Amino acid sequence: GYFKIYSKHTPIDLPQGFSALEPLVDLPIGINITRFQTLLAL
Amino acid sequence: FNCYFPLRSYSFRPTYGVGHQPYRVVVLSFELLHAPATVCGKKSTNLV
Numbered sequence: 001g002y003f004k005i006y007s008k009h010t011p012i013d014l015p016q017g018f019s020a021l022e023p024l025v026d027l028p029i030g031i032n033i034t035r036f037q038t039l040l041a042l
Numbered sequence: 043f044n045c046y047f048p049l050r051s052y053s054f055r056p057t058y059g060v061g062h063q064p065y066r067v068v069v070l071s072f073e074l075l076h077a078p079a080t081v082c083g084k085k086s087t088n089l090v
């Protein structure tokens with residue numbers, strides 16, 4: 001029932017390198033999730 | 043005939059009896075579900 005989000009930001013074909021993603025937010029939203037979609041600003 | 047308006051007024055007044063004065067009520071109901079107990083009541087003592 002917990003939605004966990006880890007994030008990392010880097011100022012740069014994905015680059016070849018190692019970077020560890022630290023935790024950002026942990027939320028007890030608790031709903032069921034099966035698919036997802038993205039939003040753009042245009 | 044036989045038709046009335048079921049909503050009647052309480053008509054509170056300061057000169058009424060103890061039982062005829064308005065007494066606000068607040069009811070709390072507690073629900074426990076399949077959620078990670080997001081509401082809780084925690085005392086912490088000073089450290090040594």
Ligand SMILES: *[C@@H]1O[C@H](CO)[C@@H](O)[C@H](O)[C@H]1NC(C)=O
Nearest residue numbers: 001030031032033034035076
């Ligand atoms: C959550 O969604 C998935 C969708 O694939 C479903 O199979 C699963 O039974 C759902 N969980 C509950 C508790 O209904």
